[model samples]
Target: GGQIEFRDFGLRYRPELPLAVQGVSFKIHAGEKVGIVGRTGAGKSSLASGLLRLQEAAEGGIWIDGVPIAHVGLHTLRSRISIIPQDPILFPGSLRMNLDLLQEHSDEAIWAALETVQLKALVASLPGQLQYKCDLSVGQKQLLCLARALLRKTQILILDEATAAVDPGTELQMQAMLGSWFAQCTVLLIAHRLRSVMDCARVLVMDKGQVAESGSPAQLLAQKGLFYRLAQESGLV
Candidate 1:
């Protein structure tokens, strides 16, 4: 179920609008760590949306483990894949309520997840640990989201600029946490920061709604192509 394949897949917001993702084709093997780099409006979010069926694909098929995802009901399809966005979502509620929104997991499980993200101690020190809100920083919010992801049984993990908004220190900590927590799952990272995707086995460069280049980080960096130019622009070269 971790395997993802796109064959000339394309999509747009409306029938008359230009396709946000057009003629895109690639294969992401099971458990592979892949990164996608692109400029603003380069179809990165569109691709992410396609995976979630937030917008249906109008052209080719998006296959997940050999099954066309379009045919799979939205709720059924989305339940297996986990997505962590740059801006983590938090509602006005207690920490316990936020972590276990469904209230399905045990208290011990909640604590374990917080501990894994290194937020357990801070939480334990709070007067109403499970009821605290607005006291956490943005970095803490993102870590909490990661902790939530750990509680779910997801096959594919998608990070859409997950670290772009955090401070450098938070970003470093997040990278470390992801390496350990999601080491076995299939990872799809879409980032503007080149360093964020350095550890990925494969890198995809998107331009004008198409895959401009695809290769390993080392392979792409060694060329004078779009990925290389992006690396240079981001000062990675």
Candidate 2:
């Protein structure tokens, strides 16, 4: 049900602006690990936004499990997908409120979700527990985002350079948890650093706002092309 297909998709931030994404077409199977990579201005981020309808397609339609998402209500479409953004935004409220944004989940469920990301100990030490304001570090905030995703159990999870602010150690740890927790869910990872997507099953290389190549990490590395050159320049070779 999580499978995503793009039909000659196009997206732009503004009508007057040149299209940020142009004629991009691809499919991500349910539970598959897919990565989007490109240099700046290559439309990597816009594709992720397209999935959430943050920016609607300028041209084609996006389908989820053979159903057109454009036909679905915005709320219904977003509710089925979870995202870990580059910067996690937390409202001034209880840690519990931040995790369960809708306030629909119980305190016990919140704590259980935190345990998956190894933030349970920190939250347990808070005097107010669920009521405590989460004065978490940057890394902790990212972890908290992951925990929220785990609790919600979305059909699709998007990581939009989610670890760009974290240290290498934290990034590695987060990647491990993400791989495990989302093992059975569709994942779309957008990253500038190629190594971040090295383990993904397929990689989509964007050039000039289009998918220039699509293949496994190793397959792309084995060929001397745009992705290979990008990888070499990034020192992944």
Candidate 3:
């Protein structure tokens, strides 16, 4: 249900601005796990914005499940996809509100999601449990975002440096959860840390608003291209 195709897609925030991402074309099969990595301003986030229609395509279009996203309604398209950004956004209210803004889920389901992310204990320690005013570490906030994603269970998931600020232990946990808990879902992970995407089925390395390299981690390392250089700098090789 989550097959994605970018056919010579391009994006620019303003009509006069140069395309932040240009001539990018690739296909991701349903349930595939793909990692996108690049230096700052290499258009990694721009590509994501294109998918979410946060910035409409400057040229070309994105297709998901054989339908052009440009033709889909915003809420209809977004409800089928989920994104966990680098900095999680939280409301200044109860933890429950942060986790379930729609209040469509039961308390049991919310607690189950919190448990899956290992935040149940922390929430339990609060004076009002789920009703407690939310204040959390960056890592915790990311986990809460994940919990929200879990509740929604969208078929396509995008993580843009979602674990960048997480502690090592929790990062590992998040990785493990992504592998298992979200195994059947299509996932696009954008990461700065090479190690985070090592196990991804394939990697897309971006440069100068294009995909400079695309292959399995080992294959890219063997190619010794931009991805290899980035991996080398990250001490992955």
Candidate 4:
């Protein structure tokens, strides 16, 4: 039910700006994990933005679970999809407020989420505990966002360089957690590090705002195409 399809989708940040993403068409089956990789300015983030409707599509549309996203209300669409971005933002509020924006979970559930993200200890030590104002490092903030996603248990999850600020060890731990935690969810991951997406079920290599290559990591590498060159540049081959 979490299937996602892009049918000739196109996007531009503004009417005056050039299309940042164009003529994209693909389908990701429910529970599949797909990786998106591209060099800087290759429109990777723009695609994510388009999915979230942070910027409306300039052409065509995206469909999720057989429903056109353009027709879905912003709140409903956003509530059903979770994104852990490279730079996450926190509102001026208590830790509890940040984690449970919808106020849907009990304290125990929130604590469990925090524990899963490895932020419980730090959050517990704060003076007001969950009530304390969120003043956390970038890595900690990302973990908190992860915890929020855990609570939501959305059908579609997007990780856009989500662990970039965390230490390598923690990043690996988080990846493992995501594997198990989001096993039944459709995941779209955008990562600059080739290693991060090496195990993805399928990968899309973006170039000049288009998918230059799409295949399994092994297949793409064997093809020695654009993805192969990228792997070479990353010293993966």
Candidate 5:
């Protein structure tokens, strides 16, 4: 995996409206864990989606390993990367069908991931066991999604507010689980809370579609910029 660079990126959900994100430029290095934080509507999701060209930027270039993202084959580029959305996408059929969407389903891989996330027992008890359709609690669904991504061996994993629905204890456990599971995958983390970014190597703050500032959280706090203020307001300080 190589760097993902967004240069002078800007966007508007509605072209006639104010910027949802603007002047967003940053580089996420191979195997790096980087965080993007800000208030709601700060464009964290938009910026993240732009990396995979999910959302087009009105102005700027998104380059992955120096190859412009738009120039790459969308499916090919996306298959190399995976996203774990806050809300998991479940196939109405069976877990097998869902996992098999990316590859021939493997019982070993599925069990391994479920075990890692501490969901093996739950999955075991579900109807049809491995063939069970995931009619799980929201948190359970999230665990399934995380595990599924791991099984895919994707090069990069971008998580978008996945822990929001979980309790604090569960949230921490989920993070630890992901940190271990995605140890080598480049991580792009978007969260509203600081604990989410605490384990991240670098922190980025986005506001009104632009990166307001960035640094190690400790370093950013010293400068007391917009991000620092946000952390404080969010009780992370």
Candidate 6:
């Protein structure tokens, strides 16, 4: 399979005894749209974090594209992946520079990225447009994250609750924008919103740091597991 694997990965915030994640393992196929979902404290973030070795795992390791990530050169390896965090991280610079990492200007590409997220008109009318220092509205800031994702070149995109801050309408817009990215890139979507994962080719339900279920959205929902209950209660599904 052209996929990554987590080989019995486990981690813990407390070092005394138990791990936050226990025997965590899953497969993320290349170019596949998969959702990593669970309730708060279910190790959704911990599991996602460990994939990039962000959280120090007490045991186990993950493999990316058949190459054990534990042995990969992190600096060189991370370039293949990029993330849009829950909160947009912007530098105190022109929005363009913030998106492009202080590189040379790219008005066309930047605007196109903005357009992808339905912020093109709003950004265009700004006082500086591409030169606009991004002091955007909360919704606009969220949109900026997606724009930044498109501008920053990466193969595997990690979006940790990327649409958590936006309203339903704005979230839909952002989801549509990101849907375009899925055409060519593999994405790790971590939204608690299950509708966010409906378009996912596969779904992974994490429970207590291990995968409780893994399958297509329809397939998983049909089983009515813990994840289904939580998603419905939270208005995600």
Best by lDDT: 3
Q: Rate the local accuracy (lDDT) of all candidates.
A: 0.81, 0.83, 0.86, 0.85, 0.76, 0.73
Where does model 1 exceed 4 Å of error? 162-165
Off by over 4 Å in 2: 162-165
Alpha carbon deviation, residue 69, candidate 1 (Å): 1.3
lDDT of 1 at 236: 83
Error of 6 at 155 (Å): 1.5
Off by over 4 Å in 6: 13-18, 102-105, 162-165, 231-237
TM-score of 1: 0.91
After TM-score superposition, what is the CA distance of residue 213 in candidate 4 from its true location, in Å? 1.1
Give each model a TM-score: 0.91, 0.94, 0.94, 0.94, 0.89, 0.83
Tell me how candidate 1 scores on lDDT: 0.81
lDDT of 1 by residue, 131-207 (tens): 77646777777777777777776678887775445567667767777667777777888887887777787988889
Question: Tens-digit lDDT track for model 6 on 1-237?
Answer: 225678788987666867888787777877666788887777777766776676666787888888877787776567557676777767887877777774644788888888888888987888987777745665667678777766766667777764445567666776675567645667888867766677677888888767798888788888899767866887866
For candidate 3, write residues 102-209 as lDDT tens digits: 898999999999999888998898899999885577777878888888898777889877544557766876787787778877888998888878888799899989
Tens-place lDDT per residue, model 5, 120-165, is: 8888988887888655766777677777777776777887775455
Which regions of candidate 3 deviate over 4 angstroms? 162-165
Q: Clash pairs of candidate 2?
A: none
TM-score of 6: 0.83
Query: What TM-score should be assigned to candidate 5?
Result: 0.89
Tell me the lDDT of candidate 4: 0.85
TM-score of model number 2: 0.94
lDDT of 4 by residue, 1-237 (tens): 568998888899888989999998888999888999989988778777887899998888999999999999999888868888787888888889989977999999999999988889989998899998855776677778888988987788888785454567557656767778778878889988877789887998888998788889999999999889999999999
Least accurate 10 contiguous residues by lDDT in model 6 = 161-170
